[PDB]
Structure 1
Amino acid sequence: SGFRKMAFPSGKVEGCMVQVTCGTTTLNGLWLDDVVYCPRHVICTSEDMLNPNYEDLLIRKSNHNFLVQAGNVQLRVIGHSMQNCVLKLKVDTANPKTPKYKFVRIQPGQTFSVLACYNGSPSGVYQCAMRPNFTIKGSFLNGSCGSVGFNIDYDCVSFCYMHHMELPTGVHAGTDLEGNFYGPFVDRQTAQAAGTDTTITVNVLAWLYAAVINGDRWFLNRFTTTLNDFNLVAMKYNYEPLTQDHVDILGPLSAQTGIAVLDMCASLKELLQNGMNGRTILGSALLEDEFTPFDVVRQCSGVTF
């Protein structure tokens, strides 16, 4: 029993991380096969930042202008190119620790693990969600860029995020591994602000089921609601619409606990209308929206990699 914010084991990703230095700027790269992937703003000087012409900056660079280091070992760059907002550096050595891997673009609401890195070396791992406004609530300092977010399925690593920047409220923005940003953000030092955020309703319901499975049951009531009447109440409290596909995805937890999705919706409605009144759920005094249905099942049934 117990329920914790839990990350994927990071060992497969750890063997892929390298340091990339261009002039005076250092950040992290992902070494897979004989390619190193990193944010293109490595080629900017603390100067180019307000309005850079990346295509131009890259035309001046030769292979030797990129120093790539894997622990203590120098990797010679033998080719370079740009794809959207990431650089691909072709190196003379295939990484012998390359996992089985895919590149995926995740949707808002989905969770992943971040391996926070500095100077090509891991500092720590944590789990977060892709918010509806296309930001994440991470922990990233100067030098963190090129840190990656990932999921594991058995032995296949799904790379889904590479970190690029920090926005005013202390939230974070980055790209997929093909270099396209999540959200309306660009890689320049200019006035940018996150859209207002909403609460991921399907995940809050998944979390309420996790609470029942672990024996925290005080918030269950004897009523039901319709999907439509629930969605009126959700909108008022800045919650995403709940769709029929979300009800289908909650099917396994609903089955396991014997509580119909629309019955749990009635319980959430009363929590939103009446507050929690100093009581906690799973040790928390706020409703938690960074667990997917799949995350709940994984932790509560003990799936391994």
Structure 2
Amino acid sequence: SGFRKMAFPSGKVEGCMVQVTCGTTTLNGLWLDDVVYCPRHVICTSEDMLNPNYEDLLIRKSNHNFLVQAGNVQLRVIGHSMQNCVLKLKVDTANPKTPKYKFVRIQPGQTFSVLACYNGSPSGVYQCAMRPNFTIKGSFLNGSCGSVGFNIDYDCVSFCYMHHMELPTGVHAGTDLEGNFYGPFVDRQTAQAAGTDTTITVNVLAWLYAAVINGDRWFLNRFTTTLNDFNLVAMKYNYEPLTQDHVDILGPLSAQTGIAVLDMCASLKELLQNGMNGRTILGSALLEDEFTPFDVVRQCSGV
């Protein structure tokens, strides 16, 4: 038993990471096949950081300035190209450790593993979620850009996020591996705000089901509620409105435990209005919303 924040094994991604340098700037890139992907903001210098014209910055630039290193090994950049907010540096040697992979766009509420890298080398791996405001709550320092988020299905590595910047509130923003940013954000040194910090209700409910699977059941009430009565209260606590589709996703968890979805909703209604009272749930004193229904089932039953 037990339940913890669990990331996917980082081995398949570790061999795909490289250091990219374009003059003074140094960050990380993804070497899949003969291409190295990295944030286009590599080509920006102190002078042109507020409102950069990347087109113009590249019309001055050549694929001779960009330096890539796979370890103390160096690959040869042979042909660059900007795609949205990503750079695609064609290299001479194809990555021998390129895994079965696919690029996918995740939606708000979904979770992914992040491999934090600096200078091309891995620092660590952690579980993350795409917040409703399209930011992610991560741990990234300078030199972290280029680091990737991913999910692993069987043999396929599904790349979904590349780190680009930190917003003023300490949250982080980035793009998918095709160069399109998540949310309204953009790669310029403007002050872009995150918005309201909404809680993912379907995730909280799933983590409550994990609690019950793991023996924690003090929060369970004999009460029940309606979709609507719940949403009328949850909305003042900045909770994501629950829908009929979320109820269905919770279908399997409701039956494995015997606890109806609207029953948990009533139990959550009371934790929100009356609190936790210093009591703990799965070692947490707050309502965790970074577990998807599918994260619960995999950790509580199999690989």
Shared fold (TM-score greater than 0.5)? yes
The residue that corresponds to 1:279 in the other structure is 279
Task: Say which SS state the counterpart of residue 196 (structure 2) adopts.
Answer: coil
User: Mean Cα displacement is larger for which, 68-77 or 30-39?
Assistant: 68-77
Q: Which runs of 5+ in 2 are unaligned?
A: none
CA–CA separation in structure 2 for the residues paired with 1:168 and 1:258 = 44
Structure 1 residue 59 displacement after superposition: 1.3
CA distance, structure 2, for counterparts of residue 55 and residue 148 of structure 1:
25
1:215 shift after superposition? 0.2
Q: Is the 2:250–2:293 Cα contact (8 Å) retained in structure 1?
A: yes
1:106-143 CA distances to partner (integer Å, 9 max, x unpaired)?
00000000000000000000001111001111000110
Q: Secondary structure at the match of 1:285?
A: coil
- Structure 2 match to 1:160: 160
Shift of 1:62: 1.5
Aligned equivalent of 1:91? 91
Query: 2:79·2:89 contact (CA, 8 Å) conserved in 1?
Result: yes
> Please, what TM-score do these two structures have when normalized by structure 1?
0.98
1:136-175 to 2 correspondence within 5 Å? Answer: 136-175=136-175
Q: What residue is the counterpart of 1:178 in the other structure? A: 178
How big is each residue's C-alpha offset from its partner over 1:35-83, in whole Å with a ceiling of 9 and x where there is no partner?
0000000011122111111011111112211111101111111111001
SS at match of 2:149: strand
Q: CA deviation at 1:99?
A: 0.5
Cα deviation for residue 149 of structure 1 reads 0.4
- 2-side partners of 1:59 and 1:125: how far apart? 37
Q: How many Å separate the matches in 2 of 1:217 and 1:27?
A: 46
> How much does 1:193 deviate?
1.2
Q: Deviations over 1:6-50 (max 9, x none)?
A: 100000000000011101111000000000000000011122111
Report deviation, 1:238: 0.7
Q: Which one is further off, 88-97 or 225-234?
A: 225-234
SS of alignment partner, residue 233 of structure 2: helix
Give the SS at the match of 1:209. helix
Report the more deviating stretch, 44-53 or 27-36: 44-53
CA shift for structure 1 position 5: 0.6
Rounded Cα–Cα distance in structure 1 between residues aligned with 2:295 and 2:193:
30
User: Distance between the aligned counterparts of 1:222 and 1:166, measured in 2?
Assistant: 44
| Residues 79-117 of structure 1, C-alpha deviations (whole Å, 9 max, x = no match) | 110011000000111100001001011000000000000
Cα distance in 1 between the residues matched to 2:149 and 2:103: 11
**Comparing 35-44 and 224-233, the one that deviates more:** 224-233
User: What is the distance in 2 between the residues matched to 1:157 and 1:7?
Assistant: 13
Cα distance in structure 2, aligned partners of 1:191 and 1:208: 37
Q: Hey, what's the Cα distance between the residues in 2 that align with 1:124 and 1:277?
A: 34
Structure 1: how far apart are the matches of 2:40 and 2:166? 16
Spell out, residue by residue over 1:236-261, the C-alpha distance to the aligned partner (whole angstroms, 9 max, x if none): 21100111111111111111001111
TM-score, with length taken from structure 2: 0.99
Distance in 2, Cα, partners of 1:235 & 1:51: 37
3-state SS of paired residue (1:63) = coil
Offset of 1:297 from its aligned partner?
0.5
Q: Aligned equivalents of 2:48 and 2:31: distance in 1? A: 26
Measure, in 2, the Cα distance between the counterparts of 1:58 and 1:302. 49
Contact 2:63 2:77 (C-alpha < 8 Å) held by counterparts = yes
Q: Does the CA contact (< 8 Å) of 2:176 and 2:182 recur in 1?
A: yes
Q: What is the alpha-carbon distance in structure 2 between the residues aligned to residue 203 and residue 211 of structure 1?
A: 12
Q: Is the 8 A contact 2:279 2:285 kept in 1?
A: yes
SS at match of 1:50: coil
- For residues 67-106 of structure 1, what are the structure 2 equivalents within 5 Å? 67-106=67-106
Q: 2:143, 2:249 → 1: CA distance?
A: 38
Q: What percent of counterpart residues are identical?
A: 100
Which stretch has the larger CA shift, 197-206 or 184-193? 184-193
Deviation at 1:196, TM superposition (A): 1.1
* Regions of 4+ moved over 6 Å: none
Contact 2:168 2:191 (8 Å CA) reproduced: no
Once the two structures are TM-superposed, the CA of residue 216 in structure 1 deviates from its matched residue by 0.1
Counterpart Cα distance in 1 of 2:127 and 2:239? 21
Q: Does 1:200 align with 2:200?
A: yes
